[PDB]
PDB file of C-alpha atoms (C1' of nucleotides) in Angstrom:
ATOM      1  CA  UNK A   1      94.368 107.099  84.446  1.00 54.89           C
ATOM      2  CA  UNK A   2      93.612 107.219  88.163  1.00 53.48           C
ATOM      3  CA  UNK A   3      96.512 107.951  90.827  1.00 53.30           C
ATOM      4  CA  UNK A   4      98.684 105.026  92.293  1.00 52.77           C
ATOM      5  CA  UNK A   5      97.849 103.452  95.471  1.00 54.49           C
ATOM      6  CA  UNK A   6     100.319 100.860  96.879  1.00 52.07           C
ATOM      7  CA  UNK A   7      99.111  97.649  98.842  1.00 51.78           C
ATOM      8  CA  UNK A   8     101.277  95.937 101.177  1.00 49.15           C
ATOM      9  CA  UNK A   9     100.228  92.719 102.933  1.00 50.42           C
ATOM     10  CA  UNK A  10     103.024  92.040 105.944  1.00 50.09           C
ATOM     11  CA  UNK A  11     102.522  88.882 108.051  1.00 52.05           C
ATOM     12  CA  UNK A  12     103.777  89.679 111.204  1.00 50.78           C
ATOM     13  CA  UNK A  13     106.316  87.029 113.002  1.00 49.17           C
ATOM     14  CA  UNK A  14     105.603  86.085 116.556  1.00 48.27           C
ATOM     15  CA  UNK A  15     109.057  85.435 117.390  1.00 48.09           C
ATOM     16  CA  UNK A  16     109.658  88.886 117.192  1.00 50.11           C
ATOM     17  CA  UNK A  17     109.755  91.164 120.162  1.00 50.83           C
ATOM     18  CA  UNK A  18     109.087  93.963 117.889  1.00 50.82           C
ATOM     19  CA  UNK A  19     106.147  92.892 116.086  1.00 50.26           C
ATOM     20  CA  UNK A  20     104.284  91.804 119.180  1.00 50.12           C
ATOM     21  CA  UNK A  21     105.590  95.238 120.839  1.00 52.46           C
ATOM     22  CA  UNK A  22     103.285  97.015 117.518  1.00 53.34           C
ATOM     23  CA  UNK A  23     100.368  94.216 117.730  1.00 50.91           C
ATOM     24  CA  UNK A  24     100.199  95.302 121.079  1.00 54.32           C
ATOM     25  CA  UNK A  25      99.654  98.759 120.749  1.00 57.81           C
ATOM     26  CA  UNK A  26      98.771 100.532 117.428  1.00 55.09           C
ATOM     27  CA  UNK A  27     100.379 103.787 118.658  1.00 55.60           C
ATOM     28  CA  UNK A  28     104.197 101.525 118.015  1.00 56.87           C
ATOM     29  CA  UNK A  29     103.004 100.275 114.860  1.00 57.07           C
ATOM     30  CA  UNK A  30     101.718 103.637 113.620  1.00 60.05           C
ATOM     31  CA  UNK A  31     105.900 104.582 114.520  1.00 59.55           C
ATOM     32  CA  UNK A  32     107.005 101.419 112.336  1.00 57.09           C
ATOM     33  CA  UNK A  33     104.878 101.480 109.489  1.00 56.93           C
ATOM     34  CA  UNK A  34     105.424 105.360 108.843  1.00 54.68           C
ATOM     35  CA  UNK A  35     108.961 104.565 108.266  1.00 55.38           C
ATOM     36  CA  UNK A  36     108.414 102.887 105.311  1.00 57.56           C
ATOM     37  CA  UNK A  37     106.800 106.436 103.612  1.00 56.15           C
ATOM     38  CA  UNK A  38     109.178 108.795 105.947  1.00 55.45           C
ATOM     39  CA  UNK A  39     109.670 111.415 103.262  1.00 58.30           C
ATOM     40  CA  UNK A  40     106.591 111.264 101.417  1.00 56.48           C
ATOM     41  CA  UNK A  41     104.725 112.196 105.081  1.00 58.30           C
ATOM     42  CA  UNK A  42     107.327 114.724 105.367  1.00 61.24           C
ATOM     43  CA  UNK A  43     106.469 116.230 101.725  1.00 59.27           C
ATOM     44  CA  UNK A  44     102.975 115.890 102.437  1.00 58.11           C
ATOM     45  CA  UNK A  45     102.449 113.460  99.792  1.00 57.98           C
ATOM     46  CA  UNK A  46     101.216 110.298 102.091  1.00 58.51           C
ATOM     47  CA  UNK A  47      97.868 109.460 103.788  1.00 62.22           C
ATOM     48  CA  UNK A  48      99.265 105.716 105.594  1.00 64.77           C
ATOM     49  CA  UNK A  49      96.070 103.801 106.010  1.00 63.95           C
ATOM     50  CA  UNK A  50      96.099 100.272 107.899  1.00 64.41           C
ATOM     51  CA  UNK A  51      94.375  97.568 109.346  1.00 62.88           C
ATOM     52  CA  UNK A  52      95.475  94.781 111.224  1.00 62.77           C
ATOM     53  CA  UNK A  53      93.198  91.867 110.237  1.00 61.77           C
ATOM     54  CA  UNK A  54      91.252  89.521 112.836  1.00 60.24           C
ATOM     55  CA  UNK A  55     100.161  84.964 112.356  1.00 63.35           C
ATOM     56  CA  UNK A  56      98.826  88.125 111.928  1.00 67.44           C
ATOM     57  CA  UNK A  57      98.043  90.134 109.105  1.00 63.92           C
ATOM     58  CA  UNK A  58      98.794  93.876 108.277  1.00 65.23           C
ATOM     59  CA  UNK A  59      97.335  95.291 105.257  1.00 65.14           C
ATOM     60  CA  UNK A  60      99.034  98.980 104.536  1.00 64.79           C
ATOM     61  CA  UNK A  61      97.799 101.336 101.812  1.00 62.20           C
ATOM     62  CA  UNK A  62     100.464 104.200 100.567  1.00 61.53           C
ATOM     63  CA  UNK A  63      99.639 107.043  98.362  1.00 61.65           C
ATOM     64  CA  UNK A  64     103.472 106.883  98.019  1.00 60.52           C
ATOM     65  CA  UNK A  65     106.101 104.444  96.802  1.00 64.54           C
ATOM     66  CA  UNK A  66     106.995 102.449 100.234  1.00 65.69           C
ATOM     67  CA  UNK A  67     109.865 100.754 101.123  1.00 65.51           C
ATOM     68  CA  UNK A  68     109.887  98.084 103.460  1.00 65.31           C
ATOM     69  CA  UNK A  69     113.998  97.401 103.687  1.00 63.74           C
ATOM     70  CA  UNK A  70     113.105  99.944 107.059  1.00 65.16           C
ATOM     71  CA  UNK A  71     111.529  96.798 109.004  1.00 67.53           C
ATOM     72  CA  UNK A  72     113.833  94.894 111.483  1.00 65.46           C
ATOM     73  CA  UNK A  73     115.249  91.627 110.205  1.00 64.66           C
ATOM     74  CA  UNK A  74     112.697  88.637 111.412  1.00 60.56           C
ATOM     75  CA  UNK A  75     109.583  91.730 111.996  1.00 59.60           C
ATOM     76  CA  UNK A  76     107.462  90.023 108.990  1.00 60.00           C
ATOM     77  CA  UNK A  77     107.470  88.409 105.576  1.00 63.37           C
ATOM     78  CA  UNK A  78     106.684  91.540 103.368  1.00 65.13           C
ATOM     79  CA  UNK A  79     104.776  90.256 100.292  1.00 66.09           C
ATOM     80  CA  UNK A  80     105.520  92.246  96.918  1.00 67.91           C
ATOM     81  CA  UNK A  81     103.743  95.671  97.216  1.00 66.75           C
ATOM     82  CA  UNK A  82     101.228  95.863  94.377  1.00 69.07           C
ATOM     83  CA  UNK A  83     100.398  99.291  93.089  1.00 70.80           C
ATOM     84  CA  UNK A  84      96.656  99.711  91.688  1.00 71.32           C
ATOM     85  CA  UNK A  85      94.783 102.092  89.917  1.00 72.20           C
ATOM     86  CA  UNK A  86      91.392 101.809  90.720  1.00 73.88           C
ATOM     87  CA  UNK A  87      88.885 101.876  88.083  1.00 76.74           C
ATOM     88  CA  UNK A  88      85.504 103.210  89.787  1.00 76.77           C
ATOM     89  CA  UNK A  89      82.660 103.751  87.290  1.00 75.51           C
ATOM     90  CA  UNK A  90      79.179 104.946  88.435  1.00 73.92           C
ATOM     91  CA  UNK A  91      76.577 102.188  89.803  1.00 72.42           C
ATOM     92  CA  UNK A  92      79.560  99.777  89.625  1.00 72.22           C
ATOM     93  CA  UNK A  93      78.506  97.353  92.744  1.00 71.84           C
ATOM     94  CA  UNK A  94      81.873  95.966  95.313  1.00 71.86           C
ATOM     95  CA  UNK A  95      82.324  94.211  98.489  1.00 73.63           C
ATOM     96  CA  UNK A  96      83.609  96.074 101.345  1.00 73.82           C
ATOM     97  CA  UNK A  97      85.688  95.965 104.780  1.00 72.59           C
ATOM     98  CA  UNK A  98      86.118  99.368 107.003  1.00 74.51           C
ATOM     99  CA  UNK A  99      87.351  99.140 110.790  1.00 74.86           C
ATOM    100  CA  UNK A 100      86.140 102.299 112.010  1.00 77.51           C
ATOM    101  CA  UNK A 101      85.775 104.493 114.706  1.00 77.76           C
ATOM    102  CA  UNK A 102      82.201 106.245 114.210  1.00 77.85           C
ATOM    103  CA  UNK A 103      82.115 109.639 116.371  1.00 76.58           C
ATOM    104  CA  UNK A 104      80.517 113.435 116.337  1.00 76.89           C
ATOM    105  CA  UNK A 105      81.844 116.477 117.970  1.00 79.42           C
ATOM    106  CA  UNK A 106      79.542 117.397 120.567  1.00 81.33           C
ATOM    107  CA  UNK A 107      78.010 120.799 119.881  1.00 83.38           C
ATOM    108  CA  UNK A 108      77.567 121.612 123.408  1.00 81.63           C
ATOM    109  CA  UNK A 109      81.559 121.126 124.438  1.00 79.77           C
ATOM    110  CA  UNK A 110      83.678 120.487 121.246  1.00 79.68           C
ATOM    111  CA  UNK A 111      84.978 116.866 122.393  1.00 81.86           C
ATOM    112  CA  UNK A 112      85.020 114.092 119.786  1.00 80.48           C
ATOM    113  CA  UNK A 113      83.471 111.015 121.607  1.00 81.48           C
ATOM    114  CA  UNK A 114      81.959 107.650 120.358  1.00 77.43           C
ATOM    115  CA  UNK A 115      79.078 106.356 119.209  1.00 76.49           C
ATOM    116  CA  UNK A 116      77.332 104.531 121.083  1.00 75.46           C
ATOM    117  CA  UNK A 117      74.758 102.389 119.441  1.00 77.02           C
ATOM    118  CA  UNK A 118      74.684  99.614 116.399  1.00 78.09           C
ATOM    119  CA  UNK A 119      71.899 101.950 115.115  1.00 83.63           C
ATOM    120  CA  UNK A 120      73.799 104.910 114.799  1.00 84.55           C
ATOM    121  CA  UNK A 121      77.217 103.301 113.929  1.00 85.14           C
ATOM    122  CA  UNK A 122      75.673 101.963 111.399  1.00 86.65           C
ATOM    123  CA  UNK A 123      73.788 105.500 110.083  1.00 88.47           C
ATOM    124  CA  UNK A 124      77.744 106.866 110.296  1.00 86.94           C
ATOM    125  CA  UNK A 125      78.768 104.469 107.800  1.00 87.10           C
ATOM    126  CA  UNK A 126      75.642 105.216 105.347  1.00 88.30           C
ATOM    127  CA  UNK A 127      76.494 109.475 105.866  1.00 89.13           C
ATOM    128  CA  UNK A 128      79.990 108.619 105.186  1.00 89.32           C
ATOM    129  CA  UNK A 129      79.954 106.486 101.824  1.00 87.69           C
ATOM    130  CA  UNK A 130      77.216 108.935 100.892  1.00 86.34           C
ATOM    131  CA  UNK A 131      79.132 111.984 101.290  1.00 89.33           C
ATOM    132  CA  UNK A 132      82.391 110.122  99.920  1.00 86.10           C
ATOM    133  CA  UNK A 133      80.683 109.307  96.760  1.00 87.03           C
ATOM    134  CA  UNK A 134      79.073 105.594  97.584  1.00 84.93           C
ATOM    135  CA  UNK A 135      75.951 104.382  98.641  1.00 85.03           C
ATOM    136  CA  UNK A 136      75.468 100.804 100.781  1.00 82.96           C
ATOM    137  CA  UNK A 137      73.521  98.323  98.382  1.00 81.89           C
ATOM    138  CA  UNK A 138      70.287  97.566 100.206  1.00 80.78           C
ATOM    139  CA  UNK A 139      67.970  94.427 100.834  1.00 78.13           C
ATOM    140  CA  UNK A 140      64.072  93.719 101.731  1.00 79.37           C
ATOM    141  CA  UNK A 141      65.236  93.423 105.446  1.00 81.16           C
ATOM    142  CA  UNK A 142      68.373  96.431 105.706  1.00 86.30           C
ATOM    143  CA  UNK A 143      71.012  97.760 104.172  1.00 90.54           C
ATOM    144  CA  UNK A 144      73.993  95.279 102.793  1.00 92.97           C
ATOM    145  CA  UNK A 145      76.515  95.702 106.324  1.00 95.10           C
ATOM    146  CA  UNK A 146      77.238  93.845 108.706  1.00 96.22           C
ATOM    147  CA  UNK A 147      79.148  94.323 112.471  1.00 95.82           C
ATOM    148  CA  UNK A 148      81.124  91.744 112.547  1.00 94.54           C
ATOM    149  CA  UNK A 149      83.375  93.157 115.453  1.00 93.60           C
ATOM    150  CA  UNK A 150      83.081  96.097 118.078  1.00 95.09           C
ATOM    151  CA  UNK A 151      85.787  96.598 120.419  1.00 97.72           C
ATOM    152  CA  UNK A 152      88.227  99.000 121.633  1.00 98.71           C
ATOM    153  CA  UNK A 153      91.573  99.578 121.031  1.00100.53           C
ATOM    154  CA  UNK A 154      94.308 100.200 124.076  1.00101.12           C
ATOM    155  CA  UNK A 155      96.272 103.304 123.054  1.00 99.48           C
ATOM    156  CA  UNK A 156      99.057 104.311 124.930  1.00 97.29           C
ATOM    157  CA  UNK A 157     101.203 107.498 123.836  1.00 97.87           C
ATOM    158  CA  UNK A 158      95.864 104.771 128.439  1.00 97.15           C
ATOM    159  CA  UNK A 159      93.196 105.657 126.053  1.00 97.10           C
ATOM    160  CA  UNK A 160      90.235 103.684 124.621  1.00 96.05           C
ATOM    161  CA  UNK A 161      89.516 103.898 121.049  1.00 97.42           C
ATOM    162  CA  UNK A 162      85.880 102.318 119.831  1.00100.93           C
ATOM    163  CA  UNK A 163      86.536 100.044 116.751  1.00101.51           C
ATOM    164  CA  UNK A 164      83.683  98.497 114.315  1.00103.10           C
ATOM    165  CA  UNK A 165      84.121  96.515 111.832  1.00104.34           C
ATOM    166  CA  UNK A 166      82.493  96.884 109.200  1.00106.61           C
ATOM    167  CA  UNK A 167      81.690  94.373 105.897  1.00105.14           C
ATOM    168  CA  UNK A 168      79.008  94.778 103.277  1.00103.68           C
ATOM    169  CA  UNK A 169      78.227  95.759  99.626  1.00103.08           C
ATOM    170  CA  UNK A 170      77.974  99.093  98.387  1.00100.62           C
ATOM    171  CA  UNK A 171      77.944 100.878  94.766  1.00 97.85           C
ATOM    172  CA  UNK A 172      80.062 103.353  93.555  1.00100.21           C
ATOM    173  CA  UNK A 173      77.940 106.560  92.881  1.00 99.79           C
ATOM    174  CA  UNK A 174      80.595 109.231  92.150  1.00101.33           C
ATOM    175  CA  UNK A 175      83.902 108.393  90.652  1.00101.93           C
ATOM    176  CA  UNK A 176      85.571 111.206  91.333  1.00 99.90           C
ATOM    177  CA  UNK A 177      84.405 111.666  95.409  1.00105.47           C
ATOM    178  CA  UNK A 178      84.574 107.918  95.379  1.00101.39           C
ATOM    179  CA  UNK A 179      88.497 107.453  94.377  1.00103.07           C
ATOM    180  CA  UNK A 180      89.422 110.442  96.543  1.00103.40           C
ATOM    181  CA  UNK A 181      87.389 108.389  99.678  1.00104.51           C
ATOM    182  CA  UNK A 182      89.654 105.987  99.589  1.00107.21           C
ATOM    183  CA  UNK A 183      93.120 107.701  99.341  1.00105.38           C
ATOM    184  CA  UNK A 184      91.971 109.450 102.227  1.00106.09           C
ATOM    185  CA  UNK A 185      90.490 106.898 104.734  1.00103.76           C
ATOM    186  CA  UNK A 186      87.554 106.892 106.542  1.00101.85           C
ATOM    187  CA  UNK A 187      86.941 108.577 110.094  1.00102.38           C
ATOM    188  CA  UNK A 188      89.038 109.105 113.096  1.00101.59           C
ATOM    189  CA  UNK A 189      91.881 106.608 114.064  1.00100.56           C
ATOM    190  CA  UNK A 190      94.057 106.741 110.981  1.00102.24           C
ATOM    191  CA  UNK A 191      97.235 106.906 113.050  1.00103.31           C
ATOM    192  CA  UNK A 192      96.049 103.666 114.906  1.00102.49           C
ATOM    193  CA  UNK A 193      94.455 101.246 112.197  1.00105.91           C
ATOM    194  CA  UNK A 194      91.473 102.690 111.810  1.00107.29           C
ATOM    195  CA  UNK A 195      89.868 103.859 108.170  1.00108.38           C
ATOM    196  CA  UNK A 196      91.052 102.204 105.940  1.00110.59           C
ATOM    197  CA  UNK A 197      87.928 101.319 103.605  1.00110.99           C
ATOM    198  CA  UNK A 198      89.347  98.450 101.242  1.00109.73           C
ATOM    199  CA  UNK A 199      87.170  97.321  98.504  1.00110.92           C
ATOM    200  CA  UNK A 200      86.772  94.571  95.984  1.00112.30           C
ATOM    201  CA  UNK A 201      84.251  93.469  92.969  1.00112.52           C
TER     202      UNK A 201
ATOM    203  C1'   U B   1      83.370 111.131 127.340  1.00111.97           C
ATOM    204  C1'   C B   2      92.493 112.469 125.488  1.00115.99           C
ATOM    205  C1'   C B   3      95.050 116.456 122.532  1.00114.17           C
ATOM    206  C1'   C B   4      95.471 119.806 118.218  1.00112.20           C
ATOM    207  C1'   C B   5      93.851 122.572 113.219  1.00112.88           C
ATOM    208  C1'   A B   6      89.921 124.824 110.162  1.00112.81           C
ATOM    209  C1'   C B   7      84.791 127.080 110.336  1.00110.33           C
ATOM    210  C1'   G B   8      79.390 132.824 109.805  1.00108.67           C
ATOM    211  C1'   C B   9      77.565 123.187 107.921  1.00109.84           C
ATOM    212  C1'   G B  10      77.106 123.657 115.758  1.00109.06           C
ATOM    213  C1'   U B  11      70.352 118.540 118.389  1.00108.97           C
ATOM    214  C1'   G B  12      78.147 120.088 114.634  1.00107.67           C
ATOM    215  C1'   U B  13      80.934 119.059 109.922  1.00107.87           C
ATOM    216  C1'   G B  14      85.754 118.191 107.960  1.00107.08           C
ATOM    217  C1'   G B  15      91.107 117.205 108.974  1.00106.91           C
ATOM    218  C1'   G B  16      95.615 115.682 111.991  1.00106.34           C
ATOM    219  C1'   G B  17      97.669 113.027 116.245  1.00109.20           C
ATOM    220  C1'   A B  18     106.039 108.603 113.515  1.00115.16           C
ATOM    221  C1'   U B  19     111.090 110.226 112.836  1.00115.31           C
TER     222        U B  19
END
RNA sequence: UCCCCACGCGUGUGGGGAU
């Protein structure tokens, strides 16, 4: 079979000081959700992947068994975890949803920084897939992706973090690369809600 | 274009950034 990967979909309750505290800054909800997989991070067993969809959704990939009993009372209605096994076969086609945050080290000083256009944002994404064992599907006018959202996020523990969103269709081209793509995540940002590629038939 | 790790992929590549 193919390793487990556990889903968690957590609507997050207004009322709660908490949850607005971690919609308000991914840094705090990076601190909640990582309670959930404590040990496993600690065993080096977890990669925690989120993304906080546009009350509000959080969708949380574990590597690990999580458990959720960590949350405060009134944080979020936890729906049952669901563990999958995904199933990639070569030139099988899916739908898919990245938030991202496309970048390059400079050669001339080291620094990770941004990109800046849609042109090259969108040239990331296609080097990515491709080197993680996908491909975007393509059309007579582009490749199959959209930007449906580019923003920033406001890190503090103030720092700016570029986010795209990306949606499109794309086909599987190497199981193997392909599966391990997306246990690991995609691009910088994983500690904030960024890289988690999510797909679906 | 904030910090850290790896490198004889540097008009950079890969990885990390709770307790």
């Amino acid at each position: 079979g193919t390793g487990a990967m556990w889903l968690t979909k957590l609507v997050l309750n207004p009322a709660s000081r908490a949850a607005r505290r971690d919609l308000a800054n991914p840094y705090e909800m990076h601190r909640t959700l990582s309670k959930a997989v404590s040990r496993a991070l600690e065993e080096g067993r977890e990669r925690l992947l989120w993304r906080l969809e546009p009350p509000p959704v959080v969708l949380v990939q574990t590597l690990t068994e999580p458990d959720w009993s960590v949350l405060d009372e009134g944080y979020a209605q936890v729906f049952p975890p669901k563990p999958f096994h995904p199933a990639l076969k070569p030139g099988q086609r899916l739908r898919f949803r990245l938030r991202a945050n496309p970048a390059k080290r400079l050669a001339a000083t080291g620094k990770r920084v941004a990109l800046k256009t849609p042109a090259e944002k969108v040239a990331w994404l296609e080097r990515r897939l491709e080197e993680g064992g996908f491909r975007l599907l393509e059309g007579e006018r582009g490749p199959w992706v959209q930007i449906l959202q580019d923003t920033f996020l406001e890190v503090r523990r103030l720092l700016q973090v570029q986010a795209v969103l990306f949606e499109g269709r794309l086909e599987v081209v190497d199981p193997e690369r392909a599966l391990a793509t997306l246990r690991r995540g995609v691009g910088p940002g994983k500690a904030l809600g960024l890289g988690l590629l999510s797909v679906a038939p």
